[PDB]
RNA sequence: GACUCGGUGAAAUCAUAGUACCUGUGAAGAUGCAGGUUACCCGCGACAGGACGGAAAGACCCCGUGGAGCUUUACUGUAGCC
RNA sequence: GACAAUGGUAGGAGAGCGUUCUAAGGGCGUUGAAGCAUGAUCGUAAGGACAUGUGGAGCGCUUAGAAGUGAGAAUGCCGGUG
RNA sequence: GAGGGUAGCGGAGAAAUUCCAAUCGAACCUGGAGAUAGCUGGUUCUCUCCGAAAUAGCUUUAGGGCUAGCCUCAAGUGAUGA
RNA sequence: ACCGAUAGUGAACCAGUACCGUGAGGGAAAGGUGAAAAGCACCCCGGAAGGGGAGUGAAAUAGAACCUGAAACCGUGUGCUUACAAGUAGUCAGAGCCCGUUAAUGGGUGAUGGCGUGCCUUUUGUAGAAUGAACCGGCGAGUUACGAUUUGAUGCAAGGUUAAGCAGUAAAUGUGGAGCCGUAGCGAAAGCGAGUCUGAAUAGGGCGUUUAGUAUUUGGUCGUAGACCCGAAACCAGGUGAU
RNA sequence: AGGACGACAUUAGACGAAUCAUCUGGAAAGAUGAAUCAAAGAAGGUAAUAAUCCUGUAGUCGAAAAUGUUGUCUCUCUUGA
């Protein structure tokens, strides 16, 4: 059987670079005013899937581009 | 020299064995090296993703050509039967540039940055 | 014309286009019409 | 009944056994370790201190995001009824 | 030729021994195959030969391929016998 | 006594969780079935080189797990290490 | 390149049979004389069984519970040794006695001296009085498929490559270029493009540009499957039972 | 919408090629010395391992009947743009 991609972290994901996972990025949904508009406009601007995990969720996204 | 084969030195390797005397005979010592042992890939004991999530998904994507085109000292295109764009739902030229030889260039969507060129050595465009 | 089947050893026989490996290393010596020789020169290139 | 003879002839257990005691030692209660003490080799009839004796993967206690049975103003439901 | 390194559980890496089947090559075998028994034999190990007795059909060697490929423990299963 | 009837989400019970073919807080048999078992037990040839950890963080987590840390193998960097 | 009598069907043999249950239902064990029955006329001890001869046979030291005939276990004979000694049974040292080999600084035994608490599991730590095994034999656990990733090997290379399907001898191979991955990336997207995104910005900053892939395959590992093996108390579904 | 003619097939079967001597031995197919066949050197059997000893194999014929099976007549049915 093909693996099953994990359509739950595909909606989150976005593969491209040179194999790296893109982005998304936590804290950014509601309940604002309570962080820093510093925090806030920081948070917004998108960072990719840590070393450490791409070692634990490389088999997920394996179809991924 | 059919009874006197041999493989290509570096491929083949004797697969490994477990469990079948004391250089090495097991796999781990306790918890999970428990038959068909568990942890599902992901399943971390607290969420893992849940953070975000962005999408859509939409229609039309063409399917780019750049300006690496030395074919012949002219000639019109698309004609890829030639060893070129393959596997095409349209056909954008883009640029890299060597315009190093002069032809009549005829794909949907053109770049602006190369037909600069493409129209600079002969002049090409088309739908 | 293989009604050598019943040979002992040497009784493979293919046409130039049924050719296989086995043969070829098995065998310690091969015999050809030409025509069957071209036609392994036709396709091999 | 046991016990002696004739007849017939099991079993639970059992890592291998040439299987002493003291004071110690040690997974902190030793036939088997140390240091002494004691003891010729092999039966039989007896007795139960020890072999943490045999028997049953501790019913107590805890644990497992085990089970089942039971209760209710636990939740979610449903046979039925107004 | 010197000179260094070489304790080791989980565990990683490496090189190998043997078992059955297949392929090709090259062989042994009723002037006695496998198996079994015995030996004071050889190799760093897994392991390999040789001699003799037994036995009365078969079997090895080289190279490569494939595996139901290696047992001392599971209160493991089955048999036999303590 | 003889012939009968009530059957397991059921039956019977002068009532004990009592009986339903020699253990009934829910009979037996066959199937789903290799239920599931973060638990215990077991896991078979040899030599050679290296060689841990029992900590942190989060965890309906606490004898389980994930990432880090520490092991190995391989690439690479190339004095950054002591 | 499936089993070869504990394997392979439960069943190589008169198996759904002995056997067990009221029933539904559960369910074994057990193959092999020899080329040929020539299956031991005859004498002998014995009631017989069984046996020594004589015989058939290549062989019965193949004789029927019959090819081979391991081990545990049971016995007969006996070369060295043993009744003042405290022993995980060996190891190291070693006289005496007996023997004579795959002939090699030999083999058997062993007065006596030194040393010395089995193995497995599980453990911070087990001689452990924690667990397991009466012994011997056989059987008995990391597999395969399909995906993923990575390594190694090989072919081509800015390309690489086929799937079904036809053809073929259940091949290899010929065919088949739908298809997949690669040559371009960035953005949620419209979309622009060696650059794009955010941005008011031709500031800055994210990802990318500067060049290598792809197909098969050995190995490692993961995923889907019972997925290394054995083990529940239980749950559901159909049935079978008030002797 | 049901039945009359002769090809093949299924259900019995037949033909089918070519070896001798010796040594060992209980026995020859083994070894060895000379041969032969082959559209047949697949396999099993025979006192040990056999292309030439037997059953066979390649190959060739073969069916009273019975089904099955079709080519083709008939057979129906036909009005077609
Ligand atoms: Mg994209
Ligand atoms: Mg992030
Ligand atoms: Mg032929
Ligand atoms: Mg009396
Ligand atoms: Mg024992
Ligand atoms: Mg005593
Ligand atoms: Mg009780
Ligand atoms: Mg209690
Ligand atoms: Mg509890
Ligand atoms: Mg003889
Ligand atoms: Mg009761
Ligand atoms: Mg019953
Ligand atoms: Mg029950
Ligand atoms: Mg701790
Ligand atoms: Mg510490
Ligand atoms: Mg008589
Ligand atoms: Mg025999
Ligand atoms: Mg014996
Ligand atoms: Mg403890
Ligand atoms: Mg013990
Ligand atoms: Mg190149
Ligand atoms: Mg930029
Ligand atoms: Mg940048
Ligand atoms: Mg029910
Ligand atoms: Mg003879
Ligand atoms: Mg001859
Ligand atoms: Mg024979
Ligand atoms: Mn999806
Ligand atoms: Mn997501
Ligand atoms: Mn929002
Ligand atoms: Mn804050
Ligand atoms: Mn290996
Ligand atoms: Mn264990
Ligand atoms: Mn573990
Ligand atoms: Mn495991
Ligand atoms: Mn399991
Ligand atoms: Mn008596
Ligand atoms: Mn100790
Ligand atoms: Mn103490
Ligand atoms: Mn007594
Ligand atoms: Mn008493
Ligand atoms: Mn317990
Ligand atoms: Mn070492
Ligand atoms: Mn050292
Ligand atoms: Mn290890
Ligand atoms: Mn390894
Ligand atoms: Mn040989
Ligand atoms: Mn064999
Ligand atoms: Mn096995
Ligand atoms: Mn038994
Ligand atoms: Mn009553
Ligand atoms: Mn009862
Ligand atoms: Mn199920
Ligand atoms: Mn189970
Ligand atoms: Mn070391
Ligand atoms: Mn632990
Ligand atoms: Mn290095
Ligand atoms: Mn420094
Ligand atoms: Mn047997
Ligand atoms: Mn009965
Ligand atoms: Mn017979
Ligand atoms: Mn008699
Ligand atoms: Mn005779
Ligand atoms: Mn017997
Ligand atoms: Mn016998
Ligand atoms: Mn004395
Ligand atoms: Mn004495
Ligand atoms: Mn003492
Ligand atoms: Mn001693
Ligand atoms: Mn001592
Ligand atoms: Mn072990
Ligand atoms: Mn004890
Ligand atoms: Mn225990
Ligand atoms: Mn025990
Ligand atoms: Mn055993
Ligand atoms: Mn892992
Ligand atoms: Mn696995
Ligand atoms: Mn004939
Ligand atoms: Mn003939
Ligand atoms: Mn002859
Ligand atoms: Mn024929």
Do not use: C, W
Not at chain 1, 36 to 43: A, G, N, V
Not at chain 2, 74 to 94: C, R, S, W, Y
């Amino acid at each position: 059987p093909k693996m099953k991609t994990h359509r739950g972290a595909a909606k989150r994901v976005k593969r491209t670079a040179s194999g790296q996972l893109k982005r998304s990025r936590a804290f950014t949904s509601h309940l604002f005013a309570n962080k820093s508009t510093k925090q806030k406009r920081q948070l917004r601007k998108a960072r990719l899937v840590s070393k450490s995990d791409m070692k634990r969720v490389k088999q997920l996204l394996a179809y991924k581009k | 020299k059919l009874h006197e084969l041999k493989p290509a030195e570096g491929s083949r390797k004797e697969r490994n064995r477990v469990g079948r005397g004391v250089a090495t005979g097991n796999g781990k010592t306790s918890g999970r090296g428990h038959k068909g042992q568990k942890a599902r890939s992901g399943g971390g004991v607290r969420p893992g993703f849940e953070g975000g999530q962005l999408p859509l998904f939409r229609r039309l994507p063409k399917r780019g050509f750049t300006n690496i085109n030395r074919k012949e000292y002219a000639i019109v295109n698309l004609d890829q039967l030639n060893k070129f764009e393959d596997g095409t739902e349209v056909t954008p030229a883009l640029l890299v540039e060597s315009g190093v030889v002069k032809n009549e260039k005829s794909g949907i969507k053109i770049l602006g940055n190369g037909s600069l060129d493409k129209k600079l050595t002969v002049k090409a465009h088309k739908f | 014309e293989n009604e050598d089947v019943n040979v002992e050893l040497s009784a493979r026989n293919i046409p130039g286009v049924q050719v296989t490996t086995a043969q070829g290393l098995n065998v310690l010596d091969i015999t050809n019409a030409d025509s069957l020789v071209i036609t392994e020169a036709a396709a091999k290139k």
